[PDB]
Design a protein around this ligand. Structure first.
Ligand SMILES: *[C@@H]1O[C@H](CO)[C@@H](O[C@@H]2O[C@H](CO)[C@@H](O)[C@H](O)[C@H]2NC(C)=O)[C@H](O)[C@H]1NC(C)=O
Ligand SMILES: Nc1nc2[nH]cnc2c(=O)[nH]1
Length: 246
């Protein structure tokens, strides 16, 4: 398991947590020096448990699929909560077995569905450590509409920051003040699969992408990534989704 406490939290301990999280994902191989996540894992070993404590010490335990860093559900005191999707029900056979009650949320866990349930796109939802603390508190008391917004924050602070160094840095900047995500942050979140695939395909091709990836950068300018020599590839992306899942 991995842990993170918001009480006394600063940019450095947050950094330690994301490092712990990356190290907890198993991998057998590296492509261009980037851990390549596994095709699959059987049984309970497929799930990593994250324990998060809000400022006041209350806690929730979150289950993550180690093959794709997707959040499947969480435990709050004695009630477990799972997304409404096949992979999450599969996950319920292996974690939080001692939960007294199991609730299935009225949505699946993809951004499209979470944004509809929340009533706002994530372009309009502030993120940061203070926002993570509020999210943990919101999740302790069941409300499907408020939970959708809390999950959008939780996902970006923990799964997305693990996938990209830039997003991890964006969160460290928001350690004491929340701020909506930049356009580059959203573009990055949307291209993880695309990037992961082109980096894997670039191998037998001199490091050149079969088809270019279109992103929006920090200063706000559109851009094309065509080879593994680019910044995104050399210092941004930290984990690769296996092609057998794309
Ligand atoms: C690899 O990506 C780099 C950008 O990261 C590209 O290099 C550019 O390539 C040509 C000349 O090599 C120029 O027209 C571009 O403006 C270069 N940009 C730079 C140096 O910032 C290029 O797309 C890729 N390299 C190869 C060999 O395909
Ligand atoms: N549930 C979950 N959903 C996502 N939707 C987009 N990315 C993620 C993730 O990392 N976990």
């Amino acid at each position: 398991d991995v842990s993170f406490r918001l009480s006394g939290a600063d940019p450095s301990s947050y950094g330690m947590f994301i490092k712990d999280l990356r190290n907890a994902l198993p991998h057998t191989e590296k492509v261009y020096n980037i851990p390549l996540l596994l095709p699959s894992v059987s049984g309970a070993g497929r799930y990593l448990l994250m324990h998060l404590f809000n400022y006041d010490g209350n806690t929730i335990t979150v289950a993550v699929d180690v093959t794709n860093v997707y959040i499947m559900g969480y435990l709050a005191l004695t009630t477990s909560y799972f997304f409404n999707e096949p992979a999450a029900d599969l996950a319920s056979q292996y974690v939080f077995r001692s939960a007294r009650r199991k609730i299935t949320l009225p949505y699946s866990g993809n951004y499209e569905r979470l944004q509809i349930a929340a009533g706002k796109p994530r372009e309009k939802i502030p993120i940061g450590l203070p926002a993570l603390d509020t999210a943990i508190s919101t999740l302790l008391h069941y409300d499907s509409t408020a939970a959708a917004g809390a999950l959008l924050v939780l996902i970006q602070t923990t799964a997305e920051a693990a996938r990209f160094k830039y997003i991890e840095q964006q969160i460290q900047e928001r350690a004491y003040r929340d701020e909506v995500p930049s356009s580059a942050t959203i573009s990055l979140e949307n291209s993880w699969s695309g990037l992961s695939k082109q980096i894997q395909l670039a191998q037998g091709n001199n490091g050149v992408f079969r088809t270019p990836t279109v992103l929006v950068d920090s200063k706000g300018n559109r851009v094309q990534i065509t080879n593994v020599t680019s910044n995104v590839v050399t210092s941004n992306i930290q984990l690769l989704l296996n092609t057998k899942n794309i």
